Amino acid sequence: AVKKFKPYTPSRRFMTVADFSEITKTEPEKSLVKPLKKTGGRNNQGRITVRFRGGGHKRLYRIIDFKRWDKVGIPAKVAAIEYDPNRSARIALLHYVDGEKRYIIAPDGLQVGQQVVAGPDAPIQVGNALPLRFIPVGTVVHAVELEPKKGAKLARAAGTSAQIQGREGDYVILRLPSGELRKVHGECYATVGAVGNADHKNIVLGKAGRSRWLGRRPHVRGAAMNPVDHPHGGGEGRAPRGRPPASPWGWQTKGLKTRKRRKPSSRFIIARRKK
């Protein structure tokens, strides 16, 4: 339930902020944070390779347990749910009966004080992780490994989920957040339920500065530039595109497909996405 503001400034008219009402702990576990080297979208040559990045708030990275098969069989208690500035989801702090403390992505409806567990035998229960082959068909799942033991790769953004649709030998058929239908190996891990903080998409940044807080520097339209800069540059007065709408680098950007055709994962993509 996003929070709104009275129009006491021009920007507060529209600004919405997350309600943060699920967060129980407001500074991070000191043994599970590390420095996040800001990049400004510059590579190791020093060149901007992703335009319009930088200048955002300082952040500590929280180390997230994307494996969970690390600790098959060891129940953990949900100790706290916390803010994480490096992702859209919230994160949950597990106190394993081992003594080990780890973070995971906070699925929807997970509660402080409940217990979660990973493994083939885990109860079909929000927060438990299992290999996909043991999750019954139809179950809504998240934090999905894309290849066995390579780490949860799919459905990790706030609100997303993947639905199990069928099985076929060693493989399961998933419907991804995009709506694509894909084979994923049965031994791949996933966590029961959807990612939480589903209201994330309804936030209205409200003012330019709020984008700047996130590290997003202003985006300049190609039509605002000059011919040396961009296909859409130049012209007297305003100007329509005057050619198929293009990127700065000249490739077409309205419909031109860019997935590599001869890609091996094609044998596993059943249906391309939707909408």
Partner 1 sequence: MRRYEVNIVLNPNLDQSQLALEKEIIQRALENYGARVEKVEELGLRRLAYPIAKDPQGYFLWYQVEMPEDRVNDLARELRIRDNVRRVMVVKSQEPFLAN
Partner RNA sequence: UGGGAGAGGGUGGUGGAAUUCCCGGAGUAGCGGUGAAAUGCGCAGAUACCGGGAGGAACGCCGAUGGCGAAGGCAGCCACCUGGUCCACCCGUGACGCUGAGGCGCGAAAGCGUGGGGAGCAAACCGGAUUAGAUACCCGGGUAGUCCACGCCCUAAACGAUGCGCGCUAGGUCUCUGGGUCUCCUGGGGGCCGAAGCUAACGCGUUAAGCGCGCCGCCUGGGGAGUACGGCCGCAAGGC
- Residues near partner 1 (CB under 8 A) are 124, 136-137
Asked if 125 interacts with RNA (CB under 7 A), we say no
256 binds, options Mg ion, partner 1, RNA, none, Cβ within 5 to 8 A by partner type: none
Alpha carbon distance 153, 151 (integer Å): 6
Q: Are 132 and 188 in contact (CB under 8 A)?
A: yes
Long-range contacts made by residues 90-99, C-beta under 8 angstroms, separation at least 24?
Answer: 90/22, 90/23, 90/158, 90/196, 90/197, 91/62, 91/64, 92/127, 93/25, 93/29, 94/65, 96/71, 98/71, 98/74
> Look-up: residue for tokens 């906070």?
106
Among 202, 247, 265, 266, interactor with RNA by CB under 7 A: 202
Tokens of 95: 């106190």
Query: In angstroms, what is the minimal distance from the CB of 136 to partner 1?
Result: 5
Burial class (CB in 10 A: 0-12, 13-18, 19+), 60: middle
Question: Given candidates 109, 120, 166, 244, which one binds Mg ion under the rule CB under 5 A?
Answer: 244
**Interface pattern 136-175 for RNA (x via CB under 7 A):** ---------------------------x-xx--------x
**Least distance in angstroms from the C-beta of 210 to RNA:** 17
Q: How far is the CB of 219 from RNA (least distance, A)?
A: 20
Query: Do the beta carbons of residue 40 and residue 54 sit within 8 Å?
Result: yes
> Is 175 within 8 Å of 183 (Cβ atoms)?
no
Quick one: what does residue 163 bind among Mg ion, partner 1, RNA, none, with the CB cut-off 5 to 8 Å set by partner type?
RNA
Count interface residues toward Mg ion (CB under 5 A).
Answer: 33
3-state secondary structure of 176: coil
26: contact with Mg ion by CB under 5 A: no
Residues of this chain that interact with RNA (CB under 7 A) are 163, 165-166, 175, 201-202, 275
Residues of this chain that interact with Mg ion (CB under 5 A) are 4-6, 20, 22, 37, 39, 41, 44, 48, 50-51, 53, 56-57, 84, 90, 147, 180, 184-185, 214, 219, 221, 235, 237, 239, 242-244, 246, 272-273
